[PDB]
Write a protein that binds this ligand. Structure first.
Ligand SMILES: Nc1ncnc2c1ncn2[C@@H]1O[C@H](COP(=O)(O)O)[C@@H](O)[C@H]1O
Ligand SMILES: [Zn+2]
Length: 251
């Protein structure tokens, strides 16, 4: 949309309720230096210069995600309000030394957790939670890295405030707060033990970068540690007033 200097990107949004990816474009201006780093990625402040369609950037014939997983229509999406021209947000790049599939899997995983957030909030707990949207962006104006595969990154809204990690994906309980731990326990019980959401982290109860474990270990990226991840959560978990309010089993 905007005529100002920045760079273009193909923007991908996953929508769980129709089970499709929605493909868009946007222009963005990203700062030169990151403002934070974790173990694997760096985060950069970025501003949006508008969201558009992908009609100038045809797909052609090896596509991931596959064509049947892509919505033919993209007129409605969260990006058009949440990343509208002017918005400050965050872009995350992996450090030098992540396949194409994993960017998409991590964004899908976050959208799945966001759904679990809504389901938890429907039980009217004392504190509601929310997982941020997340999106894949192909930075198409940048030079390809080792191959004709473009530069990929993920983007999400800016969290304002003190960022805290509340548990990890392997059993750590890092704060005293109840709601995070009760949420993890909720996802375990109400999924009939088919999955658990951990790596609950963010600002207050606005969360981002969660991790799912499933018993069979498949999908949900490299952080999916299977039954081991699940058992490690169980070992350290102490039920709290929120667990009890949600009528969860003290097993
Ligand atoms: N959405 C966000 N808004 C603001 N800060 C963030 C956000 N996500 C992550 N951070 C911070 O940036 C660091 C690097 O991101 P991560 O790759 O998720 O570890 C985190 O450890 C946080 O301190
Ligand atoms: Zn509990």
């Amino acid at each position: 949309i905007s005529s100002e200097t920045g760079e273009m990107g193909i923007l991908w949004e996953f929508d769980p309720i129709i089970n499709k990816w929605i493909r868009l474009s946007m222009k963005l201006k990203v700062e030169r230096k990151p403002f934070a780093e974790g173990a694997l990625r760096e985060a950069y402040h970025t501003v949006s210069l508008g969201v558009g369609t992908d009609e100038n950037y045809p797909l052609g014939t090896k596509l991931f995600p596959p064509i049947e997983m892509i919505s033919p229509i993209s007129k409605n999406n969260e990006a058009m309000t949440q990343l509208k021209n002017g918005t400050k947000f965050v872009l995350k790049l992996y450090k030098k030394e992540a396949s194409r599939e994993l960017y998409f899997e991590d964004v899908k995983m976050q959208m799945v957790c966001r759904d679990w957030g809504n389901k938890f909030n429907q039980k009217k707990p004392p504190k509601k939670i929310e997982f941020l949207m997340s999106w894949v962006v192909e930075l198409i104006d940048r030079s390809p890295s080792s191959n004709g595969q473009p530069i990929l990154c993920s983007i999400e809204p800016l969290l304002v405030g003190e960022f805290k990690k509340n548990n990890s994906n392997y059993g750590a309980v890092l704060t005293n707060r109840s709601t995070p731990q009760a949420f993890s326990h909720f996802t375990y019980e109400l999924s009939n033990k088919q999955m658990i959401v951990v790596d609950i982290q963010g600002v207050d109860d606005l969360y981002t970068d969660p991790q799912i474990h499933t018993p069979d270990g498949k999908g949900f990226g490299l952080g999916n540690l299977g039954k081991a991840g699940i058992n490690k959560f169980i070992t350290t978990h102490k039920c709290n007033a929120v667990c009890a309010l949600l009528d969860l089993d003290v097993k």
